[PDB]
Design a protein around this ligand. Structure first.
Ligand code: CL
Ligand code: ZN
Length: 251
């Protein structure tokens, strides 16, 4: 059918589900919209609306009931700064650099990241309990089917700059989360990987109808970046927070 041109300003590389935010690549757009409470039972834990909806789908699918609680979701700049400086004081500099993201380098400031914990009264905010057994592990194994990935694995510490965290999950959206799982990728790795697939060489994701999904990378131009899309497709576009765009096409 008809194709459609999308025109993107360079600053849109700093918006979207696939932002890479880490020590090297800071958040450059503090302007998160569509934050809502993740759950009636925790009004102070906010996250992006579609991400709260997805988190509810996962808890329903695994029958989590009340055994998993959200410990931290969206954090503003002032919250992250207070957490970092308070951890300097309580825990020391080595621990804090390994476990608390720098202000403006925290995925929590995007509304796409969530810290989860077993439901106890004894919950450590910085280290909540989220083991690789039982219901927490059911979540962990279901998560990539729904757009979530465990962000900081032990075998990727040298790449992520952050120590192993059982409890921290990041929404990137489907099928990206599933492709990362199949390949054992951290987000750092996936952000490089997808650059190998340009518009004339798209990555093809397909399960078993369902539907075919194509994904490709578009480098950002200095000014306006031009992307073509079929009117005959649901699509998503995200910046990668560095240098370009990932386009996802549902065929
Ligand atoms: Cl066109
Ligand atoms: Zn976290």
């Amino acid at each position: 059918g008809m194709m459609k041109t999308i025109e993107l300003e360079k600053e849109e590389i700093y918006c979207g589900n696939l932002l890479l935010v880490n020590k090297n690549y800071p958040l450059r757009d503090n302007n998160v919209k569509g934050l809502v409470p993740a759950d009636i039972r925790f009004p102070n834990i906010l996250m992006k609306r579609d991400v709260a909806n997805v988190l509810q789908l996962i808890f329903e699918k695994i029958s989590a009931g009340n055994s998993i609680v959200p410990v931290s979701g969206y954090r503003s700049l002032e919250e992250q700064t207070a957490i970092y400086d308070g951890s300097l004081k309580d825990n020391g500099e080595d621990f804090t650099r390994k476990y608390v993201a720098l202000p403006n380098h925290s995925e929590h400031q995007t509304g796409l990241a969530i810290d989860l914990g077993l439901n106890k009264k004894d919950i450590d905010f910085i280290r909540p309990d989220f083991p690789y057994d039982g219901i927490c592990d059911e979540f962990r194994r279901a998560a990539p089917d729904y757009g979530f990935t465990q962000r900081y694995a032990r075998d990727k510490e040298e790449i992520t700059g952050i120590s192993h965290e059982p409890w921290h999950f990041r929404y990137v959206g489907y099928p990206h989360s599933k492709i990362m799982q199949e390949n054992g990728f951290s987000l750092e790795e996936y952000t490089q990987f997808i650059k190998a697939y340009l518009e004339d060489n798209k990555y093809l994701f397909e399960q078993a109808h369902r539907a075919e999904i194509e994904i490709y990378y578009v480098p950002a131009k200095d000014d306006k970046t031009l992307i073509k899309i079929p009117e005959n497709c649901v699509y998503q576009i995200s910046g990668n927070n560095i240098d370009g765009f990932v386009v996802t096409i549902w065929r």
